[PDB]
Design a binder for this molecule. Structure first.
Ligand SMILES: CN(C)c1ccc(C(=C2C=CC(=[N+](C)C)C=C2)c2ccc(N(C)C)cc2)cc1
Ligand SMILES: [Cl-]
Lengths: 184, 184
């Protein structure tokens, strides 16, 4: 049970302070000693990796549960995926702030990145058919993920702060994202 | 005149802890004592608007430098405007994070928004000529500026961390921004 309390606490501290969040802070917010956090996670980088995989699985499980297989137009399908991404972030603001900082941290291992793609393999396929070539490359995929997350978090933030127009920010955000990242 | 130090400390502190104003810390790093402060500034709101108008001034003054005369193309001018925003942001990380924070407080007056937009009349006019009209409406103006800034900040993060490819990130980021926000 302590491992979960550690993830939860790290989720919260990283959302507010990014990866520079203190391990001593995370341990006590979880109700455990820092020395115990390091028995679960030998390094802070190992914590970073496990937390990313944990938040990732949760996000993908939530999107898969809303995935309508009847939708057959690519843009509509990506639109409903986006809505589902935004809705998860709106229901879990800290988990999304944390996942975004983790996702762009350069501390994720190759096994983590590799293991990350295989939770929703078809969503992954869908990208290689829509996304701009440059944003699929080894050099710039990470940047393309960063650009997508910045668009998403900004859409989440305006929807949260002015809910009367949530559905308008989310649709405008999607359209902006679609033009930014996808092929002609 | 010592008021310039309260603005320098406010930029940092704000850039370090959001619009939360440890006026104690402010005053201390600024030299001056506590109450010593609404003494230069009235309300915390006015300080925000003041600082904001102060940071925007610094940002415009840094660009007006890079500005040209011969360049005609609407896309080429926006490109220079974007290059300048990234340069200012990379050279002044505190200021840039201060200013994004101030713009999401909704505490800016329409006088401030007016005083800002008056600072660079060509920019105003360039947006009124290139940006999707939806993003120029009263309802969605701030959203469209939030998307631009999110894309610019992410471009900055990837540039700072990988200086070898910075020029490529800036270029990729511009083009994603331009498709996201300007006339089809
Ligand atoms: C002086 N210089 C280099 C500048 C000056 C201003 C900008 C722009 C800007 C910066 C900060 C803002 N806030 C603090 C709220 C709002 C807008 C901007 C410009 C164009 C644009 N579009 C083409 C969509 C969007 C934003 C960019 C470069
Ligand atoms: Cl405490």
């Amino acid at each position: 049970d302590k491992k979960q309390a550690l993830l939860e606490a790290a989720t919260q501290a990283i959302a507010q302070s990014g990866i520079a969040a203190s391990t001593a802070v995370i341990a006590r917010n979880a109700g455990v000693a820092e020395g115990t956090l390091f028995r679960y996670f030998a390094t802070k980088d190992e914590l970073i990796n496990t937390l990313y995989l944990h938040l990732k699985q949760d996000l993908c499980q939530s999107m898969i549960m809303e995935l309508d297989r009847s939708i057959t137009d690519a843009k509509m399908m990506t639109r409903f995926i986006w809505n589902s991404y935004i809705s998860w972030g709106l229901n879990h603001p800290a988990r999304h702030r944390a996942i975004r900082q983790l996702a762009v941290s350069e501390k994720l291992t190759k096994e983590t990145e590799q293991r990350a793609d295989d939770m929703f393999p078809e969503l992954r396929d869908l990208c290689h058919r829509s996304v701009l070539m440059v944003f699929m490359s080894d050099e710039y995929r990470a940047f393309g993920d960063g650009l997508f997350l910045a668009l998403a978090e900004t859409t989440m933030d305006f929807a949260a702060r002015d809910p009367a127009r949530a559905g308008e920010y989310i649709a405008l955000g999607f359209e902006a994202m679609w033009r930014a990242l996808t092929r002609e």
